[model samples]
Target: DKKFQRYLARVTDIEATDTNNPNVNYGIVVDCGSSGSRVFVYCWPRHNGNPHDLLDIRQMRDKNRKPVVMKIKPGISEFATSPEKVSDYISPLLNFAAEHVPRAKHKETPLYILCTAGMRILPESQQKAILEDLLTDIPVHFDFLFSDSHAEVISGKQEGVYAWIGINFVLGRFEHIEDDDEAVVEVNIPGSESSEAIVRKRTAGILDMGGVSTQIAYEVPKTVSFASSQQEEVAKNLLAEFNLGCDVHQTEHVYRVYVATFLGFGGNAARQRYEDRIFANTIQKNRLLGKQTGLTPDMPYLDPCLPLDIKDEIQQNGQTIYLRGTGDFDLCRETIQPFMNKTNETQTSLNGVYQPPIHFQNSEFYGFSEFYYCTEDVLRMGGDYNAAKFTKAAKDYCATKWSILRERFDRGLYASHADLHRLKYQCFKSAWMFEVFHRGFSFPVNYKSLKTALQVYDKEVQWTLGAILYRTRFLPLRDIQQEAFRASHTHW
Candidate 1:
């Protein structure tokens, strides 16, 4: 009864400040990803004072505590052939946001549709045409604050920075108010100090694997000693430095982050390449053995990457080649190793990339997307990524029969969200990640700073939150000035 009463007290307080409150500010962001587009609605209290406080934005949640976001199949790029149909595809998401956000606040709420790699597929001309029609149509129908500049294709570098901002923000890395125990009350008060405290906690790095690409972004110190000018120059280009505070005089929230995106290196894309490589190698071997041994289209080639006893087929040329799993973790690692672009002197690989050294003793990282999928989905290891534990789990998972894995899935031993595809590919994806982290990103095997997580602080966060925060950082200053002007003119 005591614990329930305590929980009730907290719930009541939250209910007082829920969607109906006029002081709440709303922001909508559409993440136009490759496979599909997802619209996220975020809400934060309106800044009321000249404080050092940034927007305390969080993804809006329902009574059940689920994130208030909507997803629709097929990316924005899918409408390339039918540019006119773009508005129709995006309509449902806008409607979903409208339902969650109050109609009264619609005009003030900022709506941004940030397109990623999906848009990059279209030609420049096609992109322009699609954007022109969609942007022109959105404002005419929707009442929410929409501008031409609000919707556009964001570069991969920009996306990485947003992700860094979001993860760090959630982790409270940019916070100075609560982290310090002895900070004077004068500085904590709004506008009391001439300059805000510049204390910044070590920000966490982010490793995100999507369907088509993987991105690794992390903070680097302002001054890094380089061994050579070439290293300095290369590192400089990859670094993005910015401040999060709204005040122009604010210098405390500055961060220098290094971000890199690997194209065609995501779990799905890499698997395709791996399969092709297997097919090609099998064909070459078949040709060599044709004179001595019999060649058959249905001849099963044992695949080290797949789960044991799993049968798969791929069509190459006119023949349907067969693959059966032998379930070998060590061999699977070797098979997926070449996909990292290592060994060839002509091509730059993951191992060869010039990354500014992270003082692993002080720094940590969060692995998102596929990183979470591979570990948490079947392996049941979600947090604090351990290389050895992950390897052992993967080896065991691979060594097990596909029938048993399927039976386990049916028995609900794994997460309910995990489907047949995820269960089947767990072996291959796990091995791919091991090589990518160890061989590609070159993180030490014993590095304990990395955590594989689907969410931070019990909330599923995406780069969109960071996008909205960065775009609305200056809004607080504008709002404060308007509030002061209104107060001065009032008779009260």
Candidate 2:
């Protein structure tokens, strides 16, 4: 009970204090994720500081809210809790906020609820249930957020705004503009206004690696552009179809990551399966060879042999051996070869049997030998497969996988769109991660292609408002409300 009380105490102290200014407007943002929910209260030192600064905040949970760890079972991996559970976490904070408002101009202070990727995957019934529960319990009003399929867009915009602020801050370009004022301006850019100048000048992109999905968006001056047309359509349609884009965008931006560990669904499920099989095989091989023989147990025995460094890791820590040093092509080949061959063959018999189709003239990998060749090529080109270090090994891997996947899809082996999506997704996954963490961004397409595509799409969508646009301004909000009111009143 004391532990729970201590948590509540921490929450209350953060909620009440005016960290930014003693006398200013204040607001609270509650981000609900798969794993947990966080509430942040910001003192708007001025009218413009409506969103960014957190004056106070707290993690709301029950006294009995011990972390629930579900035993792994069929369909048990999805990260979701009951609407009642969510309400339990949120009610106290809502009550606290309602009980106390900064005594002056209190009604104007805002309290917003922003739900991220976790909410997206929930069945409509569950989502509605949660909303219904919230509406019944909480006295304060709140909103749900939006997503663009590209989490990177949200991160990109934030990064861009911060970068812009840092540049201007250091140079004293906007010395006259207060922090609150600048934040509002930066926040407005990605959604409401297009700054052609900002787009041309900004260098980095944003890659958002989340639990359920990964997204890469190119951050141009006033807009964040994503790779796929379908993704762009999702953004546009969210605003046009449901008028839900702004809410989604707000949730995504505010909540940095959404946790979902679905082991057998989405892009990650396929990746997990691949890793499991690889490790399982390695384990079996090590056991047969005898653990005491000093032959590294469970060496990164991917179809392609492990790189020397990764092999060394297996040697040092058998339990910690991660499957590394295999190119995507080798991994794919190993994973799919069983299905490809009609003969019931041993691993040795299938060694040379798996050959690249005729179309893949440029790329070749029979087995470990080809992996060694590619590794050498990679080392020659600085031992990285990043865009800047685009070695032959990287190109070979991509081309080969592309060819194999295309062939498999054509052969009718991989039936579901999910399957195809997974293949393409994994091909880009590592590269995307590398770009995001090391290079500061990820792109669906390369930089030059992305820029050109965005210019065209930006012009085409100039007449239409997308989700990002709706979040940036008041006009879109007013228009939507009026339209809805009229539709309901007119009995349409």
- Model 1, residue 406: C-alpha shift (Å): 4.8
Judged by whole-model lDDT over C-alpha atoms, candidate 2 comes out at 0.33
The model with the greatest TM-score is: 1
* lDDT of the candidates, in the order given: 0.79, 0.33
Deviation in Å, model 2, residue 314 alpha carbon = 14
- Across 291-337, the per-residue lDDT of candidate 2 in tens digits comes to 32223434334333222122223323345443334445334434443
Write down the TM-score for model 2.
Answer: 0.38
RMSD of each: 6.2, 17.7
Each candidate's number of clashing pairs is 0, 10
TM-score of each: 0.80, 0.38
